[PDB]
Amino acid sequence: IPLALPAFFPAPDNRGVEAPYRKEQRLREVLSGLGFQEVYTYSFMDPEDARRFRLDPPRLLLLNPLAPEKAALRTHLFPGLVRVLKENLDLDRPERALLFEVGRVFREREETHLAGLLFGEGVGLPWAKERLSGYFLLKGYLEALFARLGLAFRVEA
Amino acid sequence: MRVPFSWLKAYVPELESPEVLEERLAGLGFETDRIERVFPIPRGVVFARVLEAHPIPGTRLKRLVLDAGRTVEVVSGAENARKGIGVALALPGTELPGLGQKVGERVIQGVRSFGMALSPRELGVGEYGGGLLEFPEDALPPGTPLSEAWPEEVVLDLEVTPNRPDALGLLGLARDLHALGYALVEPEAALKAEALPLPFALKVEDPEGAPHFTLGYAFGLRVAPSPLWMQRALFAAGMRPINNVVDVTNYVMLERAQPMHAFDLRFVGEGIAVRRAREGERLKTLDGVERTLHPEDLVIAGWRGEESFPLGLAGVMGGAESEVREDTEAIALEVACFDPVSIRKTARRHGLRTEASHRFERGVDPLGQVPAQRRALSLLQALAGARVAEALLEAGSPKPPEAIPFRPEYANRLLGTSYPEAEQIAILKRLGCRVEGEGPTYRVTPPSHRLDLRLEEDLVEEVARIQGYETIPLALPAFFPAPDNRGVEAPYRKEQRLREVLSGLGFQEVYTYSFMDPEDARRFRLDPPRLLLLNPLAPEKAALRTHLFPGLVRVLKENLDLDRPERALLFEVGRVFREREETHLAGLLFGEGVGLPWAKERLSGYFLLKGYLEALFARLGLAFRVEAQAFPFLHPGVSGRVLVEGEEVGFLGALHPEIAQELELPPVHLFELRLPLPDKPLAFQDPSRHPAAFRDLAVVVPAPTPYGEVEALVREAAGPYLESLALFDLYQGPPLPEGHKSLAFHLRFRHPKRTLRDEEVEEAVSRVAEALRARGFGLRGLDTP
Amino acid sequence: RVDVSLPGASLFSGGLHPITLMERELVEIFRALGYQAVEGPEVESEFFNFDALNIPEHHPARDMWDTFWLTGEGFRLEGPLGEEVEGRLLLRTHTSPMQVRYMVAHTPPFRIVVPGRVFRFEQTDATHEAVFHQLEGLVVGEGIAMAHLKGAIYELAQALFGPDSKVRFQPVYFPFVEPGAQFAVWWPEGGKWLELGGAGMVHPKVFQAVDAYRERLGLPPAYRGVTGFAFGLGVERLAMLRYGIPDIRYFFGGRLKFLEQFKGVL
Amino acid sequence: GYQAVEGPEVESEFFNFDALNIPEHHPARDMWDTFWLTGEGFRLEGPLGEEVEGRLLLRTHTSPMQVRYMVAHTPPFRIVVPGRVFRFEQTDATHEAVFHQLEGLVVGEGIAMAHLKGAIYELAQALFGPDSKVRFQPVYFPFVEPGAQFAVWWPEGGKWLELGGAGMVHPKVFQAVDAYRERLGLPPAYRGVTGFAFGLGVERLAMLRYGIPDIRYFFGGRLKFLEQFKGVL
């Protein structure tokens, strides 16, 4: 069978059909440039974590799970990020960490989420003492992110 | 080029309208930049006959007695006002284009002026307001409204590209239209010549500058105003009518892209000599400007005995002295083809741009002179009652154009069309080509007026534009690209990724001109630019930039002046020139810094800019180090060179205070690197799973010793099992030697396949103690935490 | 003076996960060929994942995918045109169902590439995952031939391994394709053939399920006079070979010491 | 299928003009007001790193990359060269002496003008939507035998904007390319191929697309101006 390449003007309704995908990938790239480190976590959730992490139980469960710790589908992204921080602190001793993850969450409807985590002493002169960290630091990065995206960002209690 | 609709219609009678004309020309390759209606003539403007012109004693005015149906008088101060001509009479009540108040009966220097005779400017047909419009005395019955013989006109402002010099003639345009299918009406040159010898001779002393040159002979000339149809035509085309003969030479020029000039024989002498000009040879041109010629200038000269004199600047402008005036009776008509290059230089040399130079510079039909002579001589006989000689003086023998290859099949193949062979050939023939042969590859020889038709490709474009570019279908190509085109875009992609990361990291992009102020090599302390501009836009941009930062600094200042940015983190990527063109990346830091806007503590200046850069290189996966080095434009205390993957690629530091001062700016921090940055190929390292050994130790060292040497020393001896090594505290105080520092080092060890024994870690710190002391350094800390 | 060699402010430096990088390159390679990236849902109905793809229940063919079935009320699964759809919910065993979703929502000709997380119930070792990613390809239109499918993979191989790379096509079975095939690419640097994925000419019945679903939705048929090819390749394995990752379990492991090693790949 | 490659801002007269069939002292060259340069010690590298000579200048267009690329590669291929270009002329609200162009070049057996029209049609569709359309009119360029000028209909603004020029690569360009190849030891690679090229001016397209009223803003450096584009990621 010979080798060939097709040629044709794509049908009109296929126009810019890739905008959504491109939009999200740009977001990940900016986040990686802004300073956040990407993480990939399983879509599975431990049914028991709906309690440990204080949140409504998962709406979708598995008839044939790999284990009871993965018998449901995640409702949030942060729980996994937290469990990642812990697993990291055990194997290695990261003095800090600024992570982020994008993934599908399930609750009444499948939707895409973006979650970020901040931990450690913070940012400042490694040979000095003063530092910028915690809440207002994470809020700094987020404000930069949204400034970079050209979007209004506000946080009310 | 101005295209008067009704004039073009004389050659292309079937034209639908100015709008459709614009469309036809656009598809032919001629864009119209403007279309306008131009000859407003009120009902009150009538044609009058000047029965007599009486001077008004004591004034510079004349009392004109006009026959305008009924006799009337008008006062005029126009030098050309005289008996025996026809004029444009604005009767009392008439409202004139541009004039505020109407024209009324007015008393002037003792006489009642019943209206007023008009100048081209007052009637609104031309810019000239120095004299009255001069019409033939019998042009119209006295008193008939002028509009009746001078209808409004629509004129297209056509752009005629270099490749179509034949289009610099209305008849040439008409031929393009004819090819589209329109009927073509070429003027018939009715001439009643006479077998007589020409009372003069021709001597072309420079056949290089005048490859083809002809002279016509017309005598018994009755110089007078051009008929109304011709004056309307010339005015529409942006030219001012002068008289019979002159207008005919301008008309034919505009009709067939063939500049020509009538020389009054009274000044020709024994003959015309087409020759180079002799050093400093003077010549007063038609425009009234007294000029001095250059030896490279081609001139049209006459001669009498041993006398040789310039008559006009060949192919640019005729001389004032032999212009063709009322008393002229005979002339030598110049119709030629001059060397384009020669005309080009001469025109520039004297800062002249004329309808004639323009056409000769673009090119004239090499074999059109003779046909042009008939046209002009014909019109002269008809409008100036001229008597014409049957013979011409001719010098030069231009060769006709050669046949060109023509494959129908290729035309369709190149265009991607499928025009029938017959249509292709019928088209080339309508354009005046000769088509010979039967087989697949014909022999097409183009008409001499087509200087742009030399290659087969040229002929396919003839077919395409005549068929119409819209008839070319749309397609997309398909093919496996040749092997060496693989990843040829890696470089471009590499750089764009860098800009994007920088924009995400926090830097704001800026674009600055590649120009540099020669004077800034001083202000900013740096070697002068290697490349300069022969023709700069201004002295502040007479050179090409050597660095990127200077521009960034000038940007900060300009910003601080217009707006008051409290800070700024910019970056720019661009081409720099110095021995070789290279791409640079520069960044600038300014302002209070980063921290809580409602608090006080902050992170800024040097170490902040160094933070962002370390993040940038961490993100790029590249080793980044900064060792102190001196740079004239940087602060001696805050200055270092940048190293990526162990290789000097730029600098980082604070702008020199002295430079900062001269520019009136607060402290500024910046860097500049040479792109592309080094590529660090991945070399995945499987992280060990066993526990890691922690252990601290501070190091006492002299204040001068740079952290770099310490870090480097500690690391080097740390052993093959060193995982981490960070500086968590720098102390310079009382507990130990004055003028010394202690470096708090967090260390970590780890083994790939197993765990580290408490001895191995000590054997490791040992090396870090022995090699550490050998350098005259000590260690206070020795265990964790 | 100042020690210009002292570490600066500890601003954070981010990075992208290796699958994101491998997916990005794959997507860039096909974008250069006219393909557009579109995504589908991770939770699918049996209809799209199997039935519409000619994979009926209780037949040997369906064993090629160990499904993860789901339960739970209140969950709304949207179809190709936002219409709510029903059917036994599951975790897609491959990206292939997007072939069907896309075709009902669009008209030929077109070129798409759908990357995505897929799930399969099976034990995870050093070279196997229950959770991984696939990249689907679908090109439909008049005259689309298998020669074109081979052309696509050839270009893929060239872009991925260089001019000394080559592709291999061998018959293999998939209910959603009539010629069916399995393709491998020669990896010069490693001197060996790696099996990248499966492909073939879209099965007649897939086009039929697509137009039948269209009719049942008011849309006119759009795939009666067109042909097309589709392919699906598994990202992790390609990424492993390309980044020298020895354990596929590292991907979802979350270990920073692992992830961080990919910051360099911008 | 196009790949982006860049060229040098400082070029020799040979690549910018001569190789592109634009000889000296001819009306055609007036279409580009050059910025000539002077200075010794500057090394201008050619397509294959070989040092080249010739009167230096600031490229008046990206077109010279057509020649550089073709000597350094073999057909068929598709390239697009973006780049800073320079022209000596007064800068107003809609004119610049310094601006950017995007060149396109596609060469290979059977490449036809139908393919050039196909490319612009796709450009227009991608830029303005399905209610967009392209217009092709004859125009002159020494480096192309059918020569053309193209415009795209901008629905939102209900008007035709002239994007750039294009055409089928001139016979003589392919010849200059292979002649330069021979003079360098390489075998001829463009005797049996055709191709099309185009060049469009970025600023104007950007102005219409981002609603920028003054083209001088681009190189102005004003942060209040630049910052307004952070949103476009």
Ligand SMILES: Nc1ncnc2c1ncn2[C@@H]1O[C@H](COP(=O)(O)OC(=O)[C@@H](N)Cc2ccccc2)[C@@H](O)[C@H]1O
């Ligand atoms: N447990 C696993 N871990 C990592 N990768 C896997 C695993 N199982 C399969 N893969 C990857 O998934 C790829 C294809 O998955 P399969 O289940 O074998 O076929 C499919 O999933 C088909 N849908 C592919 C297809 C699409 C379009 C037309 C024809 C065929 C393989 O090439 C392989 O690299």
Ligand SMILES: Nc1ncnc2c1ncn2[C@@H]1O[C@H](COP(=O)(O)OC(=O)[C@@H](N)Cc2ccccc2)[C@@H](O)[C@H]1O
């Ligand atoms: N002063 C200026 N300021 C901003 N844009 C300009 C200026 N002069 C021209 N441009 C832009 O430059 C584009 C083309 O430049 P021109 O000089 O007109 O043509 C060219 O530069 C040719 N090299 C283009 C080309 C390439 C390949 C084949 C054929 C033709 C125009 O469409 C216009 O939008």
Ligand SMILES: [Mn+2]
């Ligand atoms: Mn032509």
